Every structure is written in structure tokens, then in C-alpha cells.
Amino acid sequence: LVNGVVRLLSKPWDTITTKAPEPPEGVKYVLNETTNWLWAFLAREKRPRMCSREEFIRKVNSNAAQWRSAREAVEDPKFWEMVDEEREAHLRGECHTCRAIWFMWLGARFLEFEALGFLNEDHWLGRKNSGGGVEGLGLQKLGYILREVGTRPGGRIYADDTAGWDTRITRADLENEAKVLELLDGEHRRLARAIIELTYRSGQVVTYALNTFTNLAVQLVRMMEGEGVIGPDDVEKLTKGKGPKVRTWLSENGEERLSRMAVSGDDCVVKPLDDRFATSLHFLNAMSKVRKDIQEWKPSTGWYDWQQVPFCSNHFTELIMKDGRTLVTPCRGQDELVGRARISPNVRDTACLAKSYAQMWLLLYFHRRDLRLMANAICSAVPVNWVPTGRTTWSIHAGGEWMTTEDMLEVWNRVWIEENEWMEDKTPVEKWSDVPYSGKREDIWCGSLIGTRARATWAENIQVAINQVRSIIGDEKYVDYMSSLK
Ligand SMILES: [Ca+2]
Ligand SMILES: [Zn+2]
Ligand SMILES: [Zn+2]
Numbered sequence: 001l002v003n004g005v006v007r008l009l010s011k012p013w014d015t016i017t018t019k020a021p022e023p024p025e026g027v028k029y030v031l032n033e034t035t036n037w038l039w040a041f042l043a044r045e046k047r048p049r050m051c052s053r054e055e056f057i058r059k060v061n062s063n064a065a066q067w068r069s070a071r072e073a074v075e076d077p078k079f080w081e082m083v084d085e086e087r088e089a090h091l092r093g094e095c096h097t098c099r100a101i102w103f104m105w106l107g108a109r110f111l112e113f114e115a116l117g118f119l120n121e122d123h124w125l126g127r128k129n130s131g132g133g134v135e136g137l138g139l140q141k142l143g144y145i146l147r148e149v150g151t152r153p154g155g156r157i158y159a160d161d162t163a164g165w166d167t168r169i170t171r172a173d174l175e176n177e178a179k180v181l182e183l184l185d186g187e188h189r190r191l192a193r194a195i196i197e198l199t200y201r202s203g204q205v206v207t208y209a210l211n212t213f214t215n216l217a218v219q220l221v222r223m224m225e226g227e228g229v230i231g232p233d234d235v236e237k238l239t240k241g242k243g244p245k246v247r248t249w250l251s252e253n254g255e256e257r258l259s260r261m262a263v264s265g266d267d268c269v270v271k272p273l274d275d276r277f278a279t280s281l282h283f284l285n286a287m288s289k290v291r292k293d294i295q296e297w298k299p300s301t302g303w304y305d306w307q308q309v310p311f312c313s314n315h316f317t318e319l320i321m322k323d324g325r326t327l328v329t330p331c332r333g334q335d336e337l338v339g340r341a342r343i344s345p346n347v348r349d350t351a352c353l354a355k356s357y358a359q360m361w362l363l364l365y366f367h368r369r370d371l372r373l374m375a376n377a378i379c380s381a382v383p384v385n386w387v388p389t390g391r392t393t394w395s396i397h398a399g400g401e402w403m404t405t406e407d408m409l410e411v412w413n414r415v416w417i418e419e420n421e422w423m424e425d426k427t428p429v430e431k432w433s434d435v436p437y438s439g440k441r442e443d444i445w446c447g448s449l450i451g452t453r454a455r456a457t458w459a460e461n462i463q464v465a466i467n468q469v470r471s472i473i474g475d476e477k478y479v480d481y482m483s484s485l486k
Contacts, residue, residue, distance in 0.1 A: 007342055009465055010342065013339075021170075025236065030224070030234070042124055048184050050188050059121075063400040086108075114191060115188065120209055134263065149261065157304070159311065165265075173214050177214060222284050225280040227249075231282060267312055269309055322434050334368055337371060356390050357392050358382075359403075363412060368438060368446070369448055370448055373485060384405075385477060
């Protein structure tokens with residue numbers, strides 16, 4: 001279905017549209033070392049813990065992306081009676097779950113959160129703990145990280161994708177992930193072991209942590225090869241004496257090297273010491289981590305400008321505000337931005353989903369002329385008192401600040417200035433007119449319709465369109481935000 005709100009307020013946009021082989025002995029050895037070093041590094045400060053039923057109820061109630069039959073199920077105590085029976089089933093080491101098909105699916109989601117949730121809840125893949133990870137950072141934060149990684153001297157910036165990542169995960173990758181168990185004791189260990197020994201037959205949040213983990217490991221190996229610690233001769237069997245060299249390199253260099261990566265699941269950006277990384281393909285290919293859209297043995301190509309590197313479906317740009325201060329903001333093609341908002345998965349939400357998109361754009365894509373205007377139109381056409389609901393966060397696991405009834409300039413201020421640790425001057429912005437746009441020709445390159453007549457005619461007749469949507473949804477309180485523009 002189409003969102004009839006995002007649709008009607010965008011007239012100009014109407015007429016647009018059996019593998020992974022197990023690794024060889026040498027590759028298996030270096031990956032073992034690497035993943036041993038990396039678990040130890042991730043465990044150096046934090047202590048694993050079990051997550052409570054109270055934390056789960058709380059994580060279900062908040063914006064976690066039939067989200068609400070889960071909220072009803074949790075308040076049902078007969079759900080927890082079942083969870084108690086299956087938890088007991090698997091402190092033994094047995095498992096048979098994982099109208100009551102909904103309890104069984106959700107229960108499994110709790111048991112897994114209880115046993116392995118600490119990874120995400122205590123931010124084991126947050127940048128501070130993992131060096132190369134970015135867990136918990138929204139799109140306001142990521143481009144600043146790309147600009148740090150990009151700041152490190154060396155080669156080009158590489159951002160290669162694995163071709164179908166999830167199908168390239170090997171039993172060796174699974175074994176290295178399962179070393180988390182060694183970190184745990186007692187009841188926790190047994191509960192986690194029941195979870196893990198289920199893959200062998202997660203849980204998108206556990207999956208994300210484990211994907212990030214493994215990709216971090218993969219990138220460290222590729223870097224090791226790039227730097228000539230290992231090579232083509234070590235693939236089948238590691239040459240004598242190189243074992244200790246690999247451990248020494250992990251030990252003295254692992255942490256600096258991690259700070260030259262931004263890794264989010266299967267997505268990564270690496271700035272190596274030099275461009276030997278481009279031909280460093282022997283361990284990568286032997287790990288089954290074959291790059292997407294390029295012949296197996298053809299050197300990688302990277303970027304010079306951190307501002308054109310794609311990461312998490314976006315590139316990132318420096319923006320200079322009227323007061324001379326510089327933001328770093330996400331940007332992506334605008335057709336895909338509107339296209340997604342036009343998609344509906346009930347008039348209340350759709351209107352409430354349309355409003356989350358709008359408010360998302362005002363937070364993240366305010367620098368795009370058409371999205372600022374289109375966002376204010378939506379916010380003008382949807383009742384002020386309607387809470388934004390629905391999914392707008394698409395496969396990035398952090399964000400959601402736009403899911404408020406609070407004034408969006410207030411939240412813009414809190415995220416871009418107050419809570420921006422790359423904003424030295426904390427003086428607030430008082431008007432939307434002082435919140436910067438892209439350059440005009442940049443806006444156009446990323447799909448702006450500005451300068452065309454189809455959008456000329458929408459921009460000037462916008463109030464007619466807003467009024468039309470006010471009619472359909474009906475007799476409600478509406479505020480006019482169109483005067484924040486100009
Ligand atoms: Ca990528
Ligand atoms: Zn079970
Ligand atoms: Zn752009």
C-alpha cells in the first residue's frame with residue numbers, strides 16, 4: 001500500500017520510479033588468533049551479565065522498530081509461566097519452543113535477550129569498547145566517525161561489501177563467535193549455550209553484534225595481509241614462525257588498527273596503512289568473504305574523500321551554518337528518501353507514520369530543500385497532537401529522536417548542538433532559517449527537484465495540498481509550519 005499522506009503532499013514525485021567452504025588450516029589459524037585477541041579486547045573492562053525481565057518489558061515498550069501485541073503479551077503473566085518452563089528446559093540443555101505461537105516466538109526472543117543481550121545493552125560494540133564498531137551511534141554521529149577514520153594517514157579509504165554476507169559465514173566464524181561462552185559462568189553460561197547451540201540446527205540484535213564482531217575480525221586479518229605479516233604462502237598452512245608474528249601484531253597493533261575502521265554489521269569502512277590492502281585478497285577470499293561486484297582477484301578500489309564514501313546507505317557532508325560553525329550531516333539520493341516515505345505497510349497511522357518520516361527528515365535531512373519543505377507540509381497536514389508511530393529507521397539500529405510530539409527545533413538543538421560531542425560552541429539555534437541547507441548544486445546532484453517547474457508548481461501551491469489532507473483526515477487541531485521556511 002501507498003501512504004496517502006506522503007503521496008498527496010509529493011505531486012512532482014508521482015511519475016518517478018550450497019557454498020561457503022570452510023577455511024584452510026592457515027586461514028583458520030590466523031582467524032582463531034585474531035578472534036581470541038578481539039574477544040579479550042572486548043572483555044578487558046566490561047563484565048557480562050544477564051538482562052532482566054524488567055529490561056525486556058522496557059525495551060519492548062520503547063521505540064525498538066504488531067509491535068503492540070508484544071506489549072500486551074508481556075503484561076500477560078501466562079506468557080512468563082511459559083518462559084519459566086522453557087528456561088528450565090534449557091538450564092538442563094534441552095529446548096522445544098523457539099494461539100500460543102506468539103508466546104513461543106516472543107519467549108525465545110526474551111531467553112536470547114536474557115542470555116546474550118548484554119552485548120547490545122552494555123554496548124560491547126559501541127566504538128569505545130570495540131574501537132572499530134559504531135553501535136548506538138545515529139546518523140548525526142556516523143559522518144564524524146568517517147571523518148576521524150578518514151583523517152588517519154595511509155592509503156585510500158576502502159569500503160568493500162561481501163557478496164551475500166550471511167551466506168558466507170562459516171562454521172569457523174560460528175566457532176569464533178561462540179567463544180563468548182568462555183566469558184560466562186554458571187547459569188548464564190548454560191542459558192547462553194542453549195541459545196547459541198540453536199544456530200547449529202538470533203535475533204536481529206544479537207545477529208548485529210555477532211556480524212560486527214566477525215567483520216571486525218575479517219578486516220584485521222585483511223590488514224595483517226596488506227601489511228605483509230602474512231601472505232599467499234600462509235593460506236594453506238601458515239609458514240613456520242609466523243604464528244608468534246601474528247600474535248605480536250595483534251598485541252601491539254590491534255587497537256590502533258581498529259580505530260581505522262567503522263564497522264556496522266556486514267558494512268565497513270577501512271583506512272589501511274597503505275594501498276597494499278587493495279590486493280590483500282588471499283585470506284579474504286579463502287575466508288569465503290568474496291567481495292561484491294568484482295572479479296575474485298581484481299584489486300579493490302577506494303576513495304580519497306571521506307565525504308563520498310558510502311556507509312550505512314548514506315554519504316556524509318560538511319555543512320557550514322550561517323554563524324560559521326560546521327556540521328557533518330548524512331545525505332543520500334532523494335528519490336529513495338521520498339520513495340520509502342510513500343510506502344505504507346488506518347488513517348491515524350498512515351498520518352502518524354507520514355509524520356515520523358517528516359520529523360526524521362527535519363532531524364537528518366533538513367539540508368535538502370525539498371525534504372524540509374515536504375516535511376513541514378506533512379507536519380502542517382497531520383494533527384499536532386498525534387504522536388509519530390511506525391518504522392522509518394531502515395536497518396540502521398540507532399535513532400528515533402523524531403518519534404516525539406516535542407518541537408522539532410528543540411530536538412534538532414539537542415542532537416546537533418547540546419549532545420553533539422563534535423560541537424564545541426553550545427549556543428543554540430533559535431530559528432529554522434538558521435539551520436543550513438546544502439549548496440544548491442550539491443542538492444541537485446543528490447536528486448533535488450529544485451529548479452524544475454513540476455516542483456515550482458508544488459512549492460507555490462503547497463497550501464492547497466495541505467488543506468486537501470486536512471479535509472480527508474478531518475476536524476482536528478493543525479498548526480502551520482510553512483512560515484518556518486523563508
Ligand atoms: Ca559498504
Ligand atoms: Zn528454547
Ligand atoms: Zn548527497
